[PDB]
Design a protein around this ligand. Structure first.
Ligand code: CLA
Ligand code: CLA
Ligand code: CLA
Ligand code: CLA
Ligand code: CLA
Ligand code: CLA
Ligand code: CLA
Ligand SMILES: CCCCCCCCCCCCCCCC(=O)OC[C@H](COP(=O)(O)OC[C@@H](O)CO)OC(=O)CCCCCCCCCCCCCCC
Ligand SMILES: CC1=C(/C=C/C(C)=C/C=C/C(C)=C/C=C/C=C(C)/C=C/C=C(C)/C=C/C2=C(C)CCCC2(C)C)C(C)(C)CCC1
Ligand SMILES: CC1=C(/C=C/C(C)=C/C=C/C(C)=C\C=C\C=C(C)\C=C\C=C(C)\C=C\C2=C(C)CCCC2(C)C)C(C)(C)CCC1
Ligand SMILES: CC1=C(C/C=C(\C)CCC[C@H](C)CCC[C@H](C)CCCC(C)C)C(=O)c2ccccc2C1=O
Ligand code: SF4
Ligand code: SF4
Lengths: 80, 141, 69, 740, 138, 43, 74
């Protein structure tokens, strides 16, 4: 599975969760920013690795990081 | 004379191909004047005006006078451009100015390029030429 | 810092490292990155082919050095 | 048709990026500049209303008509004032057509070689001289006033654009009035044009050309107003009509048409004195074309309850396999401008390909068949234009699917049902492509391997294992047992290429029977293979532009996007744009092989010189039947051998073709930098160059960026196409001008 | 489990399920539509949303989520549920697990794979040599 | 006034670049309409 | 371009006089530089204190007899 790590520069804009095509990320409570929310990845087994979340991330550098790892049927996006 | 080269005058191949001069321009003569000018050059085995880039102040017109001409013109160009870029960064409409040139300022910074090298020397003297290394962005390592 | 103070960035991962930006806000609450700095050189951020980036980012007080007042 | 919708002003000229929203914030990065030209003519992005889009399209079409008319006026001016039309008309074969006398600035005048008659200029290959003689022009002042007419016509189109955008722009129902438009374009644009040209054929072109085809030496014939004014000149040419301002047209109004049979003829073949088409046949042609087009422009119901609604024709046509059939295609075609552009570009590309493959084997202009530079140039030009427009039709089909497909209109119609079995369609096209690639190119490389082995009995040749094109040979047979058979009222065959005898004008060959052998079987299956792969790529881009098994939301991503990231294995070039990008190279491959086959087949089996005794000495001496079966033969006797002219071209009238041969090689190899690389490297390198600029306080306000992924691909494909096409162009021109 | 819902009026397509649906896993999206409407399937073509519960079996989770995002949400349908179904018949609710959609912060959700530093404070691979340690470990 | 929004349009980069290029090309070509074939300074 | 237009005399042709001088410095008297090892009287040729060149006749014949590829003419 691919590895999605969320770094504490997250401002909780939810843009990465809204852009995930495979429902990997979610907003969880966190007192580390003004928004009160941090992104999280409970479902990285469903991660395909498209890096749409990093495209959507507005922090510099990115608070969300996708590290492509071992390939499974789910991470390869095979419908077969 | 250098490196086994001879003047085009005592070069048989040169005169042979000068006897068959083509006409580059609309001159009735054209090639004749081209060849009588090329005669002063140092030709070779092929009878073609080879160039030496050596300082060699007798044969300095082959590099050095054109070298000075090019450097002066291109440094004029560069200094004019630098002056314009420095002078539009002051206004907050700089990005508009780089696609829509402020033409009076363009001519103003154009006409002062005639003293392009000397001013740069003062900049090299001053420190208003090169930016400090702690004021410019850099990637990690 | 304070709002409107020109500051230099000491964050290496940042696009605006060793560059100045105006402080637009300092968050009074105890968060890790309270300072909003608004630059004029936009970011790389955006899709491929998109003509723009962000000019606003967040930094800590230990990752920001006040050059002016 | 609304009054003053857009205020004519210079204000938005001062505002670059007005027509979009992302483009009007100032340029922060350099990509903005590229995006500007990337979004200039995408009108459906500019606004979101079909009325404004249609008005913009109308006013842009007026501008394009202006640029075509200024082009036409330029060519007529260069043919009036800077050519040797008259000298060329005096002695056809003895003078090569020419125009564009270059300025003798630095060496340049060497390109003004003599072409005949004291004229020193660039030998042109556009075929303009031949069409001017066919149209009936004798002097050059007619061309000067035709240039004047083209200039004022361009001005008319320009002012019409200004008027129909800014002053009185039409409403949507006008543009969507599709029946009246089709009626006015069949009957009025096409039929009236055809009739008027036959009105120029009957009164101008036939008499002038009948005189020219006898040895009258042009100038001794009257200006073409005399052949309407004075039917005395109409007497000795075709005297079986009364020829009067009332009397002559009465045979038309009384079905007395065999009277007209002296000029409305259906002879066929080529004129044996000129190598062109029989101009009486072209006149009778334009007459019948006019009649059928004015008939067909009376089919569509507009306002008098008479004729068809195209919707009823479409929605009527449905069968048991295709569900609801063509229900909703009316709305699809009357609401989507891209869906119409797809069909119109594909049809114009195919018809340009048809034009290429027709004006070579029926040359319809005097002295064009024995103008081998002209023949090769027009064939190859129309093939290339057609391939480009076909790829563009596929592109706009993909754009329609991404942007203008509504599933609610398209329920169980032909569109919906092809979307529902795209996988079967694409997999079967894939298999056909692999089968054709094997059973054509593997045959070729089998032939190379057998010929290198010294086993020519084991090759696919006419001397080895024969693959005869029996069906094409039978079709060729049927076109020559038919100028007396199944086309009784016709003297000669449709074209000499199907059979007959060597029509030889001057010392050269105009057209002879083009036999088809094993080599022709092989190149035709190669052409079928290349067309099928181009279709495969373009149809995969069209049918999978919206979704796939990999990315089910490509339509949300759009038509022109690089990828959806490195995941799912990697999703680079999934977009319909990128399929068009790949189909451009494959169109290049297809059209290059077609024009190579054309050039070698003409140079080996058709073009050449006739002896006084009547023996054809072909240009390359019939090497095609034995060399074109191996790739080594194509490399040797076509690419190595015929490029001798373009590489020995320096120091003569043809040096510029050698220069452009090299320059096009350069541009093609320049393309591969953009094609093989990616923008991460270039952005990273621009970063260090930005550091250097930052050090000397000279880094610009507009941030330097690498070109985008799509932009890099587009620059690569543009340079690749320009370089390859221009290399082939320079090769073709120099070779067939020095030898033909 | 025991997924209830009428199949939408779809003529079928060659882009639907394959062997993987029957031996490895498949997915189902169940939603409720207030009216009979039209939506584009991710396996291409138009389909008719029945009034009431609609059930669609797709081959990937991403196809179900694309159906939910480009068809259901712009048609004001936000009660869909995406499940993974195994060949033995086991059904697992996947997309709106805790009842709240993932882009709304929900109390009780815990953070997974959150690194308490920045990208710059990640270690160096040279110090992070032969070990299970990677530069992104918390 | 449109005499200021022509001036700004005929001050954009594509027009002024084309103008400056045409001007220097005119200098260079009319240089070679005059005294030709200058591969070296004659000296 | 200038060769294309029938004017090869307009070719910018630059002699590699630095590398030709190096070739002369190895002993090639073809270029007429009269420098080290191509002048028999330079202290590099004679090796004034030790007089122990001894390679030099063979090498000089090698460099100044074009039948080989030892420092070809450029
Ligand atoms: C004011 C304009 C300007 C100035 C002073 C410089 C200066 C410099 N450039 Mg740069 N450059 C420019 C424009 C400019 N450049 C533009 C428009 C481009 C995009 C094509 C580049 C692309 C570029 C690259 C890739 C590199 C440099 C490098 C350098 C440095 C070494 C010199 C050199 O390589 O020459 C070469 C410069 C070119 C070939 C660019 C073409 C010259 C343009 C057309 C001049 C621009 C004038 C402007 C359009 C009009 C200003 C007039 C104003 C009144 C309106 C030097 C400080 C090198 C470096 O990194 O430092 C060692 C280097 O690698 N430049
Ligand atoms: C009186 C002259 C006049 C004036 C003042 C305007 C003014 C305006 N027009 Mg208009 N227009 C005109 C004549 C004029 N037009 C004519 C004669 C036509 C018919 C062709 C049009 C058709 C037209 C359309 C469809 C639209 C406008 C629009 C506009 C507005 C936007 C300006 C802009 O960005 O485009 C300026 C464009 C240029 C300066 C370049 C145009 C390129 C020309 C036409 C073709 C060049 C081809 C030529 C062969 C060069 C190729 C280069 C190659 C060889 C290297 C603006 C207020 C747009 C609008 O409404 O804004 C939202 C828009 O929708 N115009
Ligand atoms: C069937 C249509 C048709 C055909 C075959 C021709 C053929 C010809 N025309 Mg043309 N012409 C036409 C329509 C056509 N015309 C119309 C509608 C106009 C008015 C705009 C003109 C105006 C015109 C002028 C001014 C001239 C000609 C001339 C000529 C001759 C020159 C060669 C050429 O055009 O290439 C052949 C063209 C094609 C093979 C493509 C024709 C297809 C058209 C564009 C659409 C018709 C489609 C139709 C429904 C079905 C046909 C499909 C087909 C593929 C089987 C040639 C015999 C020249 C001449 O006078 O000869 C001496 C000349 O100067 N024509
Ligand atoms: C746009 C098409 C067009 C136009 C403008 C004309 C125009 C003309 N024709 Mg013509 N004609 C045409 C098509 C056309 N024709 C076609 C398609 C045929 C073949 C059936 C003819 C066969 C024809 C004959 C036999 C005669 C004319 C004649 C005339 C002139 C007599 C005026 C008149 O009768 O009313 C006139 C200038 C008369 C004339 O004076 O000939 C020059 C005449 O005798 N025409
Ligand atoms: C009837 C003809 C026609 C029309 C009206 C259109 C119209 C359109 N096309 Mg299109 N297209 C066509 C034919 C046509 N196309 C053909 C024949 C092809 C195959 C090559 C394409 C392939 C194509 C693609 C891949 C795309 C379009 C797109 C578009 C849209 C925007 C294009 C734009 O902004 O302009 C911009 C034009 C330029 C910036 C010019 C670029 C340079 C050209 C391509 C090279 C010209 C070089 C020249 C021939 C010689 C070199 C000279 C040089 C040495 C100086 C627009 C609605 C775009 C879209 O997104 O649609 C919604 C899109 O991405 N088209
Ligand atoms: C000359 C280089 C080259 C070759 C050989 C190919 C070959 C192929 N391309 Mg390709 N292509 C190329 C350049 C090339 N392309 C370039 C430069 C681009 C960039 C734009 C593309 C873009 C492209 C696209 C977008 C597509 C292809 C497709 C294809 C396949 C076509 C189907 C086919 O013919 O089956 C047969 C294979 C051949 C004819 C190749 C030669 C094989 C010989 C004759 C047989 C060898 C004998 C035996 C196997 C040897 C075994 C040796 C043993 C020791 C192992 C084919 C394998 C299409 C495809 O997938 O087809 C269905 C496809 O969609 N190409
Ligand atoms: C970058 C490499 C390069 C260099 C150093 C040269 C240098 C030269 N070229 Mg060349 N050329 C080149 C690339 C180059 N060219 C390319 C890429 C092409 C193809 C387009 C050509 C095509 C070409 C032609 C056809 C000719 C030249 C000519 C010349 C010579 C005279 C130029 C002149 O009149 O300047 C004078 C102008 C100035 C000094 C401007 C300054 C004055 C103002 C007022 C200050 C000169 C030595 C000409 C010649 O006679 O050859 C010897 C000529 O016939 N070139
Ligand atoms: C093909 C002859 C033909 O049209 O067959 C018949 C069938 C469509 O026939 P229909 O009777 O449905 O045609 C009615 C409408 O489509 C025409 O108005 O074609 C197909 O289903 C696709 C054929 C697969 C193509 C494989 C290649
Ligand atoms: C080429 C060109 C040009 C030229 C043009 C022209 C000059 C043209 C024309 C034109 C014309 C000049 C045309 C015409 C026409 C026509 C027609 C098409 C007709 C008609 C008709 C009708 C409508 C008829 C009717 C009738 C009937 C049938 C019945 C009764 C009787 C009558 C006979 C009346 C220009 C310059 C632009 C430029 C370049 C290109
Ligand atoms: C003797 C001679 C020679 C040689 C030469 C040489 C060897 C040289 C060198 C040199 C060097 C070793 C150098 C250096 C440098 C450094 C630096 C550091 C630089 C610089 C630059 C700059 C700084 C610039 C600036 C500017 C200006 C001034 C203007 C425009 C703008 C700009 C910014 C670009 C030869 C044989 C060839 C020829 C003959 C003569
Ligand atoms: C070379 C290359 C670049 C670099 C190419 C660039 C930056 C194109 C721009 C180059 C020209 C020189 C820009 C011109 C800048 C100014 C407009 C010049 C002023 C013009 C006056 C002189 C008239 C990419 O960005 C790239 C991206 C993706 C895949 C492949 C590649 C690729 O191969
Ligand atoms: S897009 Fe980036 S900043 Fe926004 S919630 Fe996701 S990780 Fe945090
Ligand atoms: S290589 Fe480029 S196009 Fe391919 S997935 Fe990565 S970013 Fe996208």
């Amino acid at each position: 599975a691919h590895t999605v790590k969320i770094y504490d520069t997250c401002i909780g804009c939810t843009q990465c969760v809204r852009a995930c095509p495979t429902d990997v990320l979610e907003m969880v409570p966190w007192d580390g920013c003004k928004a009160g929310q941090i992104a999280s990845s409970p479902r990285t087994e469903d991660c395909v690795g498209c890096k749409r979340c990093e495209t959507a991330c507005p922090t510099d550098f990115l608070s969300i990081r996708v590290y492509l790892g071992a390939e499974t049927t789910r991470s390869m996006g095979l419908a077969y | 004379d250098v490196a086994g080269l001879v003047p085009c005058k005592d070069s048989p191949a040169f005169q042979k191909r000068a006897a068959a001069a083509v006409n580059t321009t609309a001159d009735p003569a054209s090639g004749q004047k081209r060849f009588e000018r090329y005669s002063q050059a140092l030709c070779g085995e092929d009878g073609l005006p080879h160039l030496v880039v050596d300082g060699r102040l007798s044969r300095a017109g082959d590099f050095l006078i054109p070298s000075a001409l090019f450097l002066f013109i291109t440094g004029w160009i560069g200094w004019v451009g630098r002056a314009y870029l420095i002078a539009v960064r002051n206004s907050g409409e700089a990005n508009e100015k780089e696609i829509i040139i402020d033409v009076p300022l363009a001519i103003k910074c154009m006409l002062t390029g005639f003293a392009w090298p000397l001013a740069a020397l003062k900049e090299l003297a001053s420190g208003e030429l090169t930016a400090k290394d702690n004021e410019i962005t850099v990637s990690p390592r | 810092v304070q709002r409107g103070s020109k500051v230099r960035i000491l964050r290496p991962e940042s696009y605006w490292y060793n560059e100045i930006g105006t402080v637009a806000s300092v968050d009074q609450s105890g968060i890790k990155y309270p300072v909003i700095v608004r630059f004029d050189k936009v970011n790389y951020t955006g899709f491929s082919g998109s003509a723009g980036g962000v000019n606003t980012n967040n930094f800590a007080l230990s990752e920001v050095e006040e050059v002016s007042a | 048709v609304d009054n003053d919708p857009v205020p004519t002003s210079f204000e938005k000229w001062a505002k670059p990026g007005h027509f979009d929203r992302t483009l009007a914030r100032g340029p922060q990065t350099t990509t903005w500049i590229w995006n500007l030209h990337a979004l200039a003519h995408d009108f459906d992005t500019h606004t979101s209303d079909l009325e404004d889009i249609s008005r913009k399209i109308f006013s842009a079409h007026f501008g394009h008509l202006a640029v075509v008319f200024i082009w036409l006026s330029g060519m007529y001016f260069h043919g009036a004032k800077f050519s040797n039309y008259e000298a060329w008309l005096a002695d056809p074969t003895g003078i090569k057509p020419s125009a564009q006398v270059v300025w003798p600035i630095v060496g340049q005048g060497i390109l003004n070689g003599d072409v005949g008659g004291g004229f020193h200029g660039i030998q042109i290959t556009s075929g303009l001289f031949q069409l001017w003689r066919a149209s009936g022009i004798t002097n050059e002042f007619q061309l000067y006033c035709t240039a004047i007419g083209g200039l004022v016509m361009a001005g008319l189109m320009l002012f019409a654009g200004w008027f129909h955008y800014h002053k009185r722009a039409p409403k949507l129902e006008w543009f969507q009035n599709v029946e009246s438009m089709l009626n006015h374009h069949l009957a009025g644009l096409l039929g009236l044009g055809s009739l008027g040209w036959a009105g120029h054929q009957i009164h101008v072109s036939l008499p002038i050309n009948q005189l020219l085809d006898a040895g009258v030496a042009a100038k001794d014939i009257p200006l073409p107003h005399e052949f309407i004014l004075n039917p005395s000149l109409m007497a000795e040419l075709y005297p079986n009509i009364n020829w009067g301002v009332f009397s002559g047209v009465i045979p038309f109004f009384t079905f007395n048409w065999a009277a007209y049979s002296d000029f409305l003829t259906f002879k066929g073949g080529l004129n044996p004195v000129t190598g062109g088409l029989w101009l009486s046949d072209t006149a009778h042609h334009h007459v019948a074309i006019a009649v059928l087009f004015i008939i067909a422009g009376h089919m569509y119901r507009t306002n008098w309850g008479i004729g068809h609604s195209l919707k009823e024709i479409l929605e009527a046509h449905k069968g048991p396999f295709t569900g609801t059939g063509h229900k909703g295609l009316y709305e699809v075609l009357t609401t989507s401008w891209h869906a119409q552009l797809a069909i119109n570009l594909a049809m114009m590309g195919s018809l340009s390909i048809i034009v290429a493959q027709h004006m070579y084997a029926m040359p319809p202009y005097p002295y064009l068949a024995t103008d081998y530079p002209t023949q090769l140039s027009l064939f190859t030009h129309h093939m290339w234009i057609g391939g480009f427009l076909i790829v563009g039709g596929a592109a706009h089909g993909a754009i329609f699917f991404v942007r203008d497909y509504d599933p609610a209109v398209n329920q169980n119609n032909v569109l919906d049902r092809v979307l529902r079995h795209r996988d079967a369609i694409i997999s079967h096209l894939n298999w056909v492509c692999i089968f054709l690639g094997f059973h054509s190119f593997g045959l070729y490389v089998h032939n190379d391997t057998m010929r290198a082995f010294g086993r020519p009995q084991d090759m696919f040749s006419d001397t080895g294992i024969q693959l005869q094109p029996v069906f094409a040979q039978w079709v060729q047979h049927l076109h020559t047992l038919a100028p007396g058979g199944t086309a009784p009222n016709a003297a000669a065959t449709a074209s000499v290429a199907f059979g007959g005898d060597v029509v030889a004008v001057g010392g050269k060959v105009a057209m002879m029977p083009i036999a088809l052998g094993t080599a022709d079987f092989l190149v035709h299956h190669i052409h079928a293979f290349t067309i099928h792969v181009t279709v495969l790529i373009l149809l995969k881009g069209v049918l999978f532009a919206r979704s796939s098994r990999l990315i089910p939301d490509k339509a949300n991503l759009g038509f022109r996007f690089p990828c959806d990231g490195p995941g799912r294995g990697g999703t680079c070039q999934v977009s319909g744009w990128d399929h068009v990008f790949l189909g451009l190279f494959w169109m290049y491959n297809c059209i290059s092989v077609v024009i190579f086959h054309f050039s070698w087949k003409m140079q080996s089996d058709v073009w050449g010189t006739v002896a006084p005794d009547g023996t054809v000495s072909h240009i390359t001496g019939g090497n095609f039947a034995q060399s074109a079966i191996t790739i080594n033969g194509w490399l040797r006797d076509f690419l190595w051998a015929q490029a001798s002219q373009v590489i020995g071209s320096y120091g003569s009238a043809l040096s510029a073709y050698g220069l452009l041969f090299l320059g096009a090689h350069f541009v093609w190899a320049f393309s591969l930098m953009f094609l093989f690389s990616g923008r991460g490297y270039w952005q990273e390198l621009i970063e260090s160059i930005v550091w250097a600029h930052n050090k000397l306080k000279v880094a610009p306000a507009i941030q330097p960026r690498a070109l985008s992924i799509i932009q890099g691909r587009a620059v690569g494909v543009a340079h690749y196409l320009l370089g390859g096409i221009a290399t082939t162009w320079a090769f073709f021109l120099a070779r067939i001008i020095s030898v033909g | 489990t025991t997924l209830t819902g009428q199949p939408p009026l779809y003529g079928g397509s060659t882009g639907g399920l394959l062997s993987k649906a029957d031996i490895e896993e498949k997915y189902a999206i169940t939603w409720t539509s207030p009216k009979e409407q039209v939506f584009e399937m991710p396996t291409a073509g138009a389909a008719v949303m029945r009034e009431g519960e609609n059930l669609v079996y797709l081959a990937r989770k991403e196809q179900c989520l694309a159906l939910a995002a480009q068809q259901l949400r712009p048609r004001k349908i936000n009660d869909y549920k995406i499940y993974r179904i195994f060949p033995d018949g086991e059904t697992v609710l996947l997309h709106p697990k805790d009842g709240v959609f993932p882009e709304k912060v929900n109390q009780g959700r815990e953070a997974v794979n959150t690194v308490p530093r920045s990208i710059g404070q990640n270690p160096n691979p040279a110090q992070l040599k032969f070990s299970g340690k990677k530069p992104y470990d918390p | 006034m449109q005499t200021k929004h022509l001036l700004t349009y005929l001050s954009t980069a594509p027009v002024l670049a084309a103008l400056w290029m045409t001007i220097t090309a005119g200098i260079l070509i009319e240089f070679n309409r005059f005294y030709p074939d200058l591969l070296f300074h004659p000296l | 371009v200038v060769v294309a237009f029938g004017t090869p005399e307009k070719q910018i042709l630059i002699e590699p006089v630095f590398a030709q001088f190096i070739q002369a410095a190895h002993g090639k008297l073809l270029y007429g530089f009269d420098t080290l090892l191509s002048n028999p009287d330079s202290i590099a040729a004679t090796a004034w204190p030790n007089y122990g060149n001894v390679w030099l006749p063979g090498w000089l014949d090698a460099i100044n007899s074009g039948n080989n590829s030892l420092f070809l003419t450029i």
